[PDB]
């Protein structure tokens, strides 16, 4: 499957539509398609690449920084998140979390 992922940067008021394989991380696909996004460790261990879901689901089982309450609130570490549906996600959300 290949899922439609919509990246929303609220502070800048931008929207980008990308297509992400079910076996590729969202951040990697975004970059390949010309859309740079924040990151540092690329290993699910910091919050630099955090996003927040608007709709849809991800598999971010490789992540280790976010706690269960943050996951239930919709936060996602985009560097280790595979889409499992079409997704709409707000990017640049780390400031929510520090
Ligand atoms: S860049 Fe560190 S968790 Fe994603």
Swiss-Prot record:
**Residues engaged in binding [2Fe-2S] cluster:** 41, 46, 49, 79
Q: Name one GO biological process term.
A: electron transport chain
**Cofactor needs:** [2Fe-2S] cluster
State whether keyword Cytoplasm applies.
no
Q: Which InterPro entries match?
A: 2Fe-2S_ferredoxin-like_sf, 2Fe-2S_ferredoxin-type, 2Fe2S_fd_BS, Beta-grasp_dom_sf, Fd_pln
Keyword vocabulary terms for this entry = 2Fe-2S, Electron transport, Iron, Iron-sulfur, Metal-binding, Transport
Q: Keyword Glycosyltransferase on this protein?
A: no
Stored PROSITE patterns: 2FE2S_FER_1 (PS00197), 2FE2S_FER_2 (PS51085)
Stretches assigned to the 2Fe-2S ferredoxin-type domain: 3-95
Q: How is the cofactor bound?
A: Binds 1 [2Fe-2S] cluster.
Pfam families, from UniProt? Fer2
GO molecular function, a single term: metal ion binding
Return the similarity comment: Belongs to the 2Fe2S plant-type ferredoxin family.
Question: What is the purpose of this protein?
Answer: Ferredoxins are iron-sulfur proteins that transfer electrons in a wide variety of metabolic reactions.
Q: How does it assemble?
A: Forms a complex with heterodimeric ferredoxin-thioredoxin reductase (FTR) and thioredoxin.
Task: Quote the protein name from its UniProt record.
Answer: Ferredoxin-1
Which gene holds the coding sequence for this protein? petF
């Amino acid at each position: 499957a290949t899922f439609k992922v919509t990246l929303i940067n609220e502070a800048e008021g931008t929207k980008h539509e990308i297509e992400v394989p079910d076996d590729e991380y969202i951040l990697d696909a975004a970059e390949e398609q010309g859309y740079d996004l924040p990151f540092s460790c690329r290993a699910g261990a910091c919050s630099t690449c955090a996003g927040k879901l608007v709709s849809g689901t991800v598999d971010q089982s490789d992540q280790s920084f976010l706690d269960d309450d943050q996951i239930e609130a919709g936060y996602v570490l985009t560097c280790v998140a595979y889409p499992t549906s079409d997704v709409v996600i707000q990017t640049h959300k780390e400031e929510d979390l520090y």
